[PDB]
Design an enzyme around this catalytic site. Sequence first.
Site, PDB file in Angstrom:
ATOM      1  N   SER A  29       0.818  -1.212   0.000  1.00 17.07           N
ATOM      2  CA  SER A  29       0.000   0.000   0.000  1.00 17.07           C
ATOM      3  C   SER A  29       0.852   1.263   0.000  1.00 17.07           C
ATOM      4  O   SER A  29       0.427   2.298  -0.525  1.00 17.07           O
ATOM      5  CB  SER A  29      -0.936   0.002   1.209  1.00 17.07           C
ATOM      6  OG  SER A  29      -0.236  -0.333   2.395  1.00 17.07           O
ATOM      7  N   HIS A  88      -4.390  -3.258  -0.304  1.00 19.46           N
ATOM      8  CA  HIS A  88      -5.199  -3.445   0.894  1.00 19.46           C
ATOM      9  C   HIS A  88      -5.428  -2.095   1.560  1.00 19.46           C
ATOM     10  O   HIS A  88      -4.691  -1.133   1.327  1.00 19.46           O
ATOM     11  CB  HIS A  88      -4.540  -4.419   1.874  1.00 19.46           C
ATOM     12  CG  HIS A  88      -3.291  -3.895   2.509  1.00 19.46           C
ATOM     13  ND1 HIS A  88      -2.090  -3.819   1.839  1.00 19.46           N
ATOM     14  CD2 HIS A  88      -3.055  -3.425   3.757  1.00 19.46           C
ATOM     15  CE1 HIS A  88      -1.169  -3.322   2.644  1.00 19.46           C
ATOM     16  NE2 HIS A  88      -1.728  -3.074   3.814  1.00 19.46           N
TER      17      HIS A  88
END
Lengths: 338, 148, 133, 162, 227, 187, 179, 217, 193
Positions: free
Chosen positions: B42, B67
């Site tokens: 991320s 995510h």
Amino acid sequence: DRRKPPPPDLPSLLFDQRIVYLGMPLVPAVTELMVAELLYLEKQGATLPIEMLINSSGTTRQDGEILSFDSEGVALTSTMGFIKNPISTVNMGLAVGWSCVVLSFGRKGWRKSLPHSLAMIQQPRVPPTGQRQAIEVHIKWREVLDYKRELLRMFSLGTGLPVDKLDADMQRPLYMRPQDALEYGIIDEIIEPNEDKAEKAAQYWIRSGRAESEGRLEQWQEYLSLQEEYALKDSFRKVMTQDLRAAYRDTSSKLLKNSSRNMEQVQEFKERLPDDMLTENDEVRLPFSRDGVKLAILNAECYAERNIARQVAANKVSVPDKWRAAYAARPAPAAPAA
Amino acid sequence: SKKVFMIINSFGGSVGNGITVHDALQFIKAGSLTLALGVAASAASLALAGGTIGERYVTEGCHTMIHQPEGGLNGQASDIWIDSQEIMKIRLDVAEIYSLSTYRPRHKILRDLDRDFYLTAMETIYYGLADEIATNEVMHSIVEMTNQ
Amino acid sequence: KKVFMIINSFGGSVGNGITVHDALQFIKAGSLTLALGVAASAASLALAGGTIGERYVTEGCHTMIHQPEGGLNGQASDIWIDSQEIMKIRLDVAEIYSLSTYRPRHKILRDLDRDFYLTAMETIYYGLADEIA
Amino acid sequence: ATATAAPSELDDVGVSAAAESIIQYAINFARASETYEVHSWMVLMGILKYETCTAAKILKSLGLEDLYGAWNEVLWALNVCDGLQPRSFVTDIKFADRAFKVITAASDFAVWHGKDKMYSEDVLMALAAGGVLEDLFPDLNLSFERVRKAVEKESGRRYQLP
Amino acid sequence: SPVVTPDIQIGHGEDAIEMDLYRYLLSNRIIFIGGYINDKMATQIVGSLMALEAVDENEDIRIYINSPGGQPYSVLGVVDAMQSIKPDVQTVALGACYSYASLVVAAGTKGKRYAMKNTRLMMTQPMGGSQGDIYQIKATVEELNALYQIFSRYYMKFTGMNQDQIEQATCRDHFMTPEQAKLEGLIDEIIRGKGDYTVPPAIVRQFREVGLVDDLTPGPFLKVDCN
Amino acid sequence: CRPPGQRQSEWVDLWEAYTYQKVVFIKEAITEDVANNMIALTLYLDSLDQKRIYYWLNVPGGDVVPTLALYDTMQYVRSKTATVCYGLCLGMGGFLLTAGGEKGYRFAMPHSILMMHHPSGASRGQASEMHIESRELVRMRDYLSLLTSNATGQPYDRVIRELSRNKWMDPKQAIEYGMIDKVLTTP
Amino acid sequence: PFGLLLRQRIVFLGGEVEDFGADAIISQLLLLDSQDPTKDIKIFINSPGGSVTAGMGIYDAMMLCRADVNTYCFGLAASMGAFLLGAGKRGKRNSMPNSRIMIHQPLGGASGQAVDIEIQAKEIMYHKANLNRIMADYCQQPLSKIEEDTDRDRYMSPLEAKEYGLIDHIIGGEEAVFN
Amino acid sequence: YPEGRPLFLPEAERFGNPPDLPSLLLQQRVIYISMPFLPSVTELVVAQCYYLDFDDRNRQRPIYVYLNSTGCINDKGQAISADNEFYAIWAALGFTRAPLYTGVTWKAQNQAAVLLSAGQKGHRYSFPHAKISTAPPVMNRVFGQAVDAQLQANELDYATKYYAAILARSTGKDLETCQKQYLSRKRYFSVKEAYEEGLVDKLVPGFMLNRFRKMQK
Amino acid sequence: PNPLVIERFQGVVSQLFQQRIVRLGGAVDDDMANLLVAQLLYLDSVDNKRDITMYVNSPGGSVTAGMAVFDTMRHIRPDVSTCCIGLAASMGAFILASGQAGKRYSLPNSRIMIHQPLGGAQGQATDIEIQANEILHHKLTLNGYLAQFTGQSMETITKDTDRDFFMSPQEAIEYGLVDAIISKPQMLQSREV
């Protein structure tokens, strides 16, 4: 080129271009370097601008860990006021606590920030005392009051808001958006992205054809279809609660009392008619909804599936199973059940 | 030196650090070429999307993991209500970056951001996070242009 | 020629403040003491140890004045000897402040009883500084 | 440019009492309703509350004689379509991008109308150019070509547009 | 209790002293479930269920449940032992229920599932952890699918809902009020006070979803528009 | 002391710049590791030239055995020494003030805190070896008192009675006790 | 409580199997056999594991019991309780219709001298060889098929445990077993 | 302002020997790995092959890779790292035009062993008393739901499919043969039978026994 | 400490059951709340008309552990007389406010402390907003219950409950926490003339 040696590393390269990089959190080890960096640039000229980058969580960590005091943030803004050159500060990402105070203490008109940066201001953290005496708590609370008022003093000269307004929003940790920091007084303008990179990226998806061949048209249609179904859902929720208030006003019209004229004598005497008051109480008028629009045509839905009910008339004496309260409740001609 | 080359190989960290590297690559006037090795978390996929469209290369063994960011802390009752609106706003903030760089709808980004979504080398090109499959030739021209 | 140092301290023992006090008067030339942020008990001894007429202070700076602290544990006899140590150290730092503030010594021991904080206004009235920078 | 977005262009520039009461009614209404933005639809809220202005007689000839219900019809339209969600606190009330074009066009029309002071018909002409009268009253057909002939017959002056 | 918990019991008699609190309540066919449901106290609840089975076969055995969770196999052993006895079981929900204690209060007989006013219920998919090699990773996902398929048809027998409503509820962390759990079929009767009919904020959000309350007319409820 | 200085043309550290200027600084406590660097520094300056060595002490205490390693190197060298006090010398650090420079070369600041006490030790185990280490601690106690009696001119019977307990000195009493020679003024 | 089930000759095997918990079950099993050698003894097994040294003493105690034994599996049976499940009398083996059965080899750690490693390496192999040949008697299964099913670390539903030969009857009429 | 150009062996022979022992190996185009695959040690090996392909004149000398590590699986069995870190190693090593001569000193635990066979065929050097182990990799502690264990099963599914594709190109076997022989159980390999299997080819160059040198004298 | 203090404390609590007095002491935990639920249903069984003098002295505790203590007092047949000794907490004064109207007593030197319930959130991004709704469910119901006990409005409760607020027994009569003050009559103290 032969007489001037190149810089050996990256912070020495940014030092030659008069760029101060605050990438570390506010520890006492890094504050002695910034009072030596800004005092060195003042001796090299009081007219050259100073570029400043802000990326820190302030005197405390973001999770609540207390690593230092808020008093080292006071000495950082004191060198900015003692110096006499224009300072251009740029917020880079995170700015919590005293890091946004030195962001707002820059020159007005040169305070810059990224469009996706994070800004936040809150109350300073206090370490525990360790079960000491009673009278030291009042002196420790006076240490809080002198440092809280000093934080509101440096925050007022950078923005312009009064002390009583800034103290109420500082009781809770209020996060600041870059679109919200313009009207609050933190920054002055928004650093824009490269326009040459924007038009070259938009022209690449059209020429290569990746914006339509990889199934983007069927998925963007579902984004507009789900927004159309969501706009149809709340509109049906709003017309049902409007019919409930219309039925509430129709049932309230069959009343014979004088409770409404008692509130008129104790309130103001100007608006004896329903009119605007220019305050919180904005009274809406729901029966004045005669639109008559010939554009909102109904779809291919038939309403012949509605069954036939009993349709009991209004002039009935049938009362439900309730406690007796008909002491002064006279039976209305339109509602004899009272 | 009109183009920069930064190899992306990390397991990711906080989501606030991935915002700064993405905003800095879209600010400089020079070109930004981004190449990933291993995975893109991320904090790393924002640097993958932060590059210019057309020169984002991933290898055959490269993966991509998207995510929602974690966080949270202990406090009072109303203090949790403030930061939960911030995590929901940061989750909408990273959804704006994935919808702009990959030209995906906003409702389909949050469905894949709800769980730990892993991507292969094939479906990363089909999603829009990268541009083409890397090979020897796409990096042989990189090491020969930086010599002068 | 003239020494210029930044004063910034929030903690530390006051015994180290006596080491930096006598080192400032060892210099033949003048001294410029400029306090920033917090000035603890070890930092105020270096602030008062400078030359009279060149002790600057900002608008947001504060000065912490308190008695010495120590940790005593052991046999019964050396506690009584070390009790006179912390007493005469507190009497020593009272005579250090008395050479600059021109005040009687019995009023400084009353301010040295508890923790004493000063803002930028009454620091000039109490003689720890000279003017506001 | 954005130099006109200041209170000096609404107070230090010569504006008649019929037109300055409409703009002043739109400022405190956004403050009392806890949404500190001025939209183009709430400018039409002011011209229907003050019936003593000369622009209120233009709507009587167009087919809007019911004065009080039309003031509440746009108040109902601002509740369920645009929304009246209260925000926290904004000190300086900002203008929307749609309503900012109504103010700069009303001052630009007054050079073309030949009037040194801002009149209340110039607010009605600038609102009809944005098309806010068509969406609020579609059955009466509030077109831009119809209001261009209604003001010139009532005021008795040929208004030229390039 | 931060340091110690004293023995809160009462035994009083004119001639002899009686037992403590938990021994006296167990003789009156009342079982208490407190603390974490591990393998140690799982034999205490099942063993007391077999103790009161031999005493009487017709009296209603009552079980009081107050636990913030437990082991998924230890909470599985108390349900199927409760369904394989002769008399009916009257369950009473105490405190909170986090994905395992909500199963045993729903596993009671129909008409005897009593929940209080401020009880917290929760239903989710079971958790777990990956371990080592791919021969055990495939054994782990086959174990988590087995625990999800067993707990799916448990709620189908006791509540009578559809399997699509369970998958939409157990996908994320879903906390249920007893006023909401009465509609789902988890319980049978709501326990209130002396005319206590306060509305919880989960029903105020439910009233906002159907369109009964707006921001202009909040009614005699609590404020919910502070989002 | 972390920023360095200059010797004549290049950058050298602050403690090593005074090493070439024949000034020795001691700021930390006397431990086994810092005493290995001090007695190696005394032999290095003795091999270069033969002049007076200056020692500035800030010792807050230390061990007994590495302190005697630095004391014996003062008498072994053929050069002269001079101990000057600033700050505080506690425990065995106050004994090193009276190491050398007895003929008018013991200076001190007017606010130096002095401290003199008997040394200590700790070694446990067998009862038979406890008698041997007790003889070592007794032989270290009277020998440390014999050197303070000869340097300060005090009688030997008074040092055993006074330094066995806690004893602290100001620079006003350090003149009449013979512990220091002169007091440093403002210049 | 637990004493009420003891006079009705019902014992419980709960928790992790240890050396202190092993002989407590063996000492009460021989007391029931000396009181009545005709009345059956019902046991309840709920164990997430245990040592192979102390777990074999529970198996030898049930073989030492002259009276018949009845087993009941509730909760968990992981690598030690599944061996004690089938070890009872055939035809009197019941369990819960949703209980889990785990057939896997026991674990163990090895450290020390080089001759010390090879002693305990073949010792845990002899424990693996003895546990396979004992569990293959009451299951009516071949040795080559039962020695590879214990290597797979996958649990077993009680539906397929019946035709496997480990268990005889299921409480609940064999319709409440969920896959 | 002048460019910092690098110097190589036909040019830096007049500037003296390198001072530190990793810099002697970097000049000799030899990479010695004595540490398991940590995120700190994987950044230097990417910059090392970037430096060897930066300003090399001939770009044809064989790169010697000496590996001595546990890969990502330690001796106890848990995962100190993940298998995705090895994908950055093989993609960076195989990029260069120079051939990859691979050698092993002692051990290669399930990540360095598939890199041992991934070198140039005909020059797999090895010590005559080393240990080689090929086992399927494991994953670290992950606490998730039922669908979280399924996506972690797909990561190890691609791990066995990528590791068997390297062994099929090296040993000359099928795709399912390398999964049944190597990536099924935790087995070990010696030096002698690995030559018949196809892991190594020869020993280290210049190897000679001290007793065999006494027999010549 | 030593169990002799615990044995002499277990005796005087056992004498309190004969006078229909229950004990709420220490932090409100999950196990201690189950000891107090079972001791309230037993006192109703010997007599369903006599009141129960509830002793309340707690410095804090869990929020859902005290929720089982609250609703078990409203449904039983006799009223529960609650008294404040020493200190009340956020889960302590909620027990104090849950008593019968006209039978809530206090001592003039005890402290009544009330605030919003504490806690924390940790996990995924969807796990933050769900766990935030759990504390806001505990925030709105305690503010909803306190408005019915004291008779105040909804907005004036949350303006004082959001921070840690201490209360005096002299001002608790005017606010609505306790109904009366049980104290002995004072001595006839002569003035200083």
